[PDB]
Symmetry: C5
Subunit: 268 residues, 5 copies
């Protein structure tokens, strides 16, 4: 794409969208927002995580307003994503230490719940085309379930970087977070942002405000250009683990808010 | 609201406090605390009793009476009474309980610190850890909110219109609304987490949006909201209660012409 | 006070001062810098913290040089504080893990002392008049000893904010840290800065440098104005707890350094 | 090298490269990305860390397109595969081992993240926890380094000239050299520390020095070096191995006239 | 000490300070203290020589009058790489199972450096005033109860390497007009060490007036302590582990009265 002039009163639009988490349990059922209880393999050889027990990436394509093209010009207008605000919603719910939680003083049947604790994985991506993925796994001999999208028998090389093992995030709730990450060799037309804090007893730390704005412009002053007039949102928002009295543990996820400002860009 | 020129007599300043609503009744010996937290066995038999969970604090501040509206341009906010957390002697589980020795363990665990300042009530998203929780009659909640309530459901909206009754654990700020409010929030989780608090009279936050417009005080009302969970108070017998702290606000407003 | 012009030539001065901590144990006896061993009540109603077992605020008024007043002027000169350096001194001493401390591996009588750990409370205030206080307590039914300055029988409202419960920090070593904090409704003529990190096994975190200057000027470019030609300094520097082999714990505090640059200001 | 004027497309090139980690286990086999299970010696005197049980630096030379030299002016770098650390099912010691319940504990313990970009091999200082350690034949070390190798000895020098054979625990960047290399490094210690990693394609680091000069690529060669220890993998039987991640590099060079 | 204009003219020195954690140099525990013993009370407290760290220090010789003025510095904790060692005679993560890595180096961090035109000026201050320091150590003997906090009588200067106990001396903020000092402390005995290294960080040494330290007698004074944490043996004996510090200083010629 040959990028040309920015248009400056009717040249800018705003979209707002949410992505619900895909932590593994089905929508419209009692554990929506959570994974199912996590089972652990005895070895890498026999490792087979069941469907529902691991999170997947969230994705959506947002259809943009009419650009009102110039019928006789040899150029076209494209929506250019210039800025965003993103917030993890429902942080407030993590003040719940009463709902069926392993207690601080289990031996005394006393104390609050321990609440949600452990690993936070927070990433979002805003592009003019689907997020480009690198396949990479902890254990290449893991047998993923039929419901999941992965590279089957990916080989030892998939435990680190293999340039043959590529993907694109083309479907919501089926690309396992533990098997796909953003590809830094691609995503020329996406901005991605990721933070990981590991562990299983780590205090979760989350902020929320409606006062924060991230500029989406690259080093040439060009934001994502929305090919076929779509805006591609991707995320994963693991808050940590929910622990039952019987010590079963499940992933807990939260939904993400996006506001994206776009402006009209002349191209070609 | 169409926003015209800043009027430049033109400036006012209010100070206010919101006391915390951790659950125990005001004017009684456990004011500032929740009652002792009980935990359900399962999501299906989950009814957190009244007094055992915190609620948002809120207040409408009356301001002096094309039109002029009061426009909020800056604030200072301070969590008050941080000093009281140096108390490790008041009926606290001890560091070496099995020796009946050491300090009290003092206040530890989750911090949830949020404030909002706007020209109308805080717009809220309903969201809960367990949709099947039965909240007490005293609480304001969406009843039988459905499985969708565990994540984002665009039907499940509310506005913060009463002090001490909107459970923190069931409402948060709606990012899809609040064009006329600035909100700020931090959560640190856990039950033995060290609390981290700062205080100073030297910090101003600017409340102007990208367009240089502050919150515009509809009907000459300034809306303040907070929640300041500091962590938990643990008794000798291991019973745990939320402890909260009051919040100071100073807001600077200017006359702005509109319509 | 009506505030007029700055003098910029004679017109500048610096004072340096220390405040020693008032953690509870008497001065120039063997436990100076410490509290006595902390006792814990069984309930709120029978809560009576003995004198010496809890810290108090440090404060001093510093006498300033003669201003050399213009005898015939309608106006008057005051000293205006414009900047400070402050440092917690003796941080070096906390590398001591041999001095009668509970050992890391007590069941094996082995390892270092555990050293000082637990809550940090670090605050300082620089003003032209005494620090204005808000009375607030964890437990209102606490009976403070006669040695201590408190509001007696303050009632339930004292557990949160009650606008009736005020004070000024008019004496060193007697205002319990746990019952008084800075009053954000007053202190127009004082700058105060406070940090708390809780717990009883929290690692203390402290920094020291002679390269850090804090400006004391308000939004109007006016510093604290020294009424009756006094500078008021206040602090509390709880570093954490000292734990003995028998598991007795005391507060440990450190002294604070102040450097304050003042300049002549004309006022009505 | 006398450094004259910047030549201003055809004057700018951009390379991209990955460095796979060298945690110890062989390439293209089932434990690629890990060390073998760590053994611990009884004393300094008889301390022989076996080949495969310790990490080594990753390094590559990239071949690039009055003389003209390539001058590295900026980079992006990213630790890849951070996403795999959300795996708590793969043969991991469980949170509640006694009850055979909970997630795996996942990767925890020490983080060591370092990268270097230079016009020549990274210049190294030899320094070791225990000088009496006997390294295996596969490792490049200074043999019989002496007690002074446990701190700084100006005699104990090297350059990173070989991928996967310079042990991290024996070699670090030499601050007395590396005039023509930029290095960055962070260590967080412990064995139960939570790993903290970030990733984004939006961060650029400028490689120009105080004089506006970046690494100048000798022999038309760009030198990349790293080590990315994420933490430890703990089996059900409490055996612990290093886990590493590959690092991405993007480097932007310009033609520089030199003498 | 009146300063005129900045006046061939710019020079740069590099130095290293090895750590003085207690164990004698060029012997097998160089970089470590000896195993720490703990007193039963303040009254009998007598830390043995080799069981506590001392400050490192050196004077570097440099090449109306002219003085060398220190304008900027680079400093680096060297050898952070060695802390990836979890095999060398360390208490194991799962000692009851004789399994896991070593726990490695853990506990308190104390990192301080000073760059000045004269010896670093010290304030004497001790946890316990009744501690008896050994003959080898430079201390104020019988310093009294006020030495547990600030006493203005209890001053010193860092005149010697490896003999001023870290736990007895810190920088005096009432003096050091011609030194820049920087310190960080993180306590605990199981705290994770956090260390960074780059050749890309330069600290400016100019004061508010734009004057850096002026090197009296053409001597540059370098001081540091870098306690990274503790080494714990299988038998639970614990010793300080320290690391050496790199210093790059840029000096320019300043005219003085
Ligand atoms: C992630 C996964 O699937 N892990 C499962 C696996 O663990 C093995 C792997 O982690 C390998 C990776 O190299 O490491 C094994 O541990 C060995 C290995 O580290 C070795 C050095 O390379 O040192 C020890 O083994 C010693 C010796 O070298 C071995 O040859 C010897 O092996 C004997 C067997 O133990 C006997 O059962 C057999 O009859 O005869 C051989 C002798 O020829 O054992 C020596 C120590 O006694 C390390 O232990 C990992 N193995 C183990 C036991 O953890 O496989 C195990 C089941 O073995 C689990 O399924 C694990 O989940
Ligand atoms: C939060 C709450 O109310 N929890 C209570 C609930 O726990 C059950 C739920 O958490 C569900 C969520 O899917 O999982 C149950 O555990 C199951 C499943 O994870 C299942 C896979 O879907 O795998 C295990 O069950 C298998 C098998 O599928 C079962 O049909 C079979 O009977 O048992 C197998 C295991 O041996 C796994 O156990 C949770 N059940 C238990 C137990 O925790 O319900 C329980 C009472 O049953 C408690 O009240 C919880 O508080
Ligand atoms: C800080 C302090 O001084 N605490 C001492 C006090 O503890 C009691 C308080 O913490 C109050 C605060 O409301 O709670 C008591 O626990 C009760 C309540 O939480 C109650 C519901 O409001 O629920 C429990 O009581 C139920 C039932 O509701 C009661 O009517 C019944 O008599 O007992 C039931 C037992 O399940 C809960 O226990 C605190 N009481 C105890 C006990 O902790 O008084 C105690 C000694 O009695 C100690 O002195 C505390 O230090
Ligand atoms: C790192 C290593 O290889 N450690 C192995 C070693 O441990 C010994 C070393 O740590 C040295 C370093 O100086 O200290 C020994 O501990 C001794 C000393 O600290 C000593 C004072 O210098 O104080 C203690 O010993 C005293 C006395 O001085 C001794 O002469 C007397 O025999 O015993 C006294 C106390 O009862 C202190 O114990 C370390 N020794 C031990 C033991 O830990 O050697 C041991 C086995 O000898 C292990 O192999 C270590 O892994
Ligand atoms: C740091 C050090 O050297 N500690 C050793 C020392 O411990 C004693 C000191 O900590 C002093 C400091 O004031 O306190 C003793 O504890 C006492 C006091 O806190 C006291 C009130 O001032 O309260 C307790 O004692 C009361 C009563 O006052 C006593 O008269 C009576 O004998 O016992 C009462 C309680 O039953 C409290 O115990 C420290 N004493 C002890 C013991 O910890 O001295 C001891 C030997 O006694 C050890 O050598 C310490 O390491
Ligand atoms: C990640 C993984 O492989 N999980 C597997 C688990 C665990 O191996 C065991 O629960 C440990 O005993 O075993 C199953 O039979 C189960 O519980 O459903 C099947 C599942 O494929
Ligand atoms: C804070 C507090 O109330 N402390 C009180 C302590 C503790 O309650 C007990 O030591 C617990 O057993 O008891 C006293 O008898 C004491 O030891 O002097 C009275 C003192 O006022
Ligand atoms: Mg590319
Ligand atoms: Mg909106
Ligand atoms: Mg006021
Ligand atoms: Mg050099
Ligand atoms: Mg001075």
């Amino acid at each position: 794409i040959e990028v040309l002039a920015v248009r400056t009163p009717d040249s800018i639009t705003e979209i707002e969208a949410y992505l619900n988490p895909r932590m593994g349990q089905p929508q419209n059922e009692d554990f929506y927002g959570f994974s199912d209880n996590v089972t652990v393999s005895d070895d890498f050889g026999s490792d087979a995580p069941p469907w529902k027990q691991f999170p997947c990436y969230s994705t959506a394509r947002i259809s943009l307003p009419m650009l009102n093209q110039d019928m006789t010009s040899d150029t076209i207008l494209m929506w250019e994503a210039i800025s965003c605000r993103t917030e993890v919603m429902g942080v407030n719910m993590l003040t719940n230490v009463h709902s069926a939680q392993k207690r601080v003083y289990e031996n005394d049947r006393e104390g609050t719940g321990i609440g949600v604790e452990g690993m936070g994985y927070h990433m979002f991506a805003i592009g003019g085309e689907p997020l480009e993925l690198q396949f990479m796994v902890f254990n290449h001999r893991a047998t993923y379930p039929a419901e999941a999208t992965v590279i089957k028998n990916p080989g030892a090389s998939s435990q680190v970087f293999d340039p043959n093992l590529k993907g694109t995030l083309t479907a919501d709730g089926v690309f396992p977070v533990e098997a796909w990450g953003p590809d830094p060799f691609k995503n020329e037309n996406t901005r991605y942002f990721g933070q990981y804090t590991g562990g299983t007893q780590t205090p979760p730390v989350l902020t929320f405000t409606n006062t924060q704005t991230t500029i989406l412009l690259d080093e040439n002053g060009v934001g994502p250009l929305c090919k076929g007039d779509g805006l591609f949102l991707s995320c994963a928002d693991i808050v940590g683990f929910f622990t039952q009295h019987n010590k079963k543990m499940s992933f807990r996820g939260l939904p993400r808010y996006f506001r994206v400002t776009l402006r009209k860009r002349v191209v070609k």
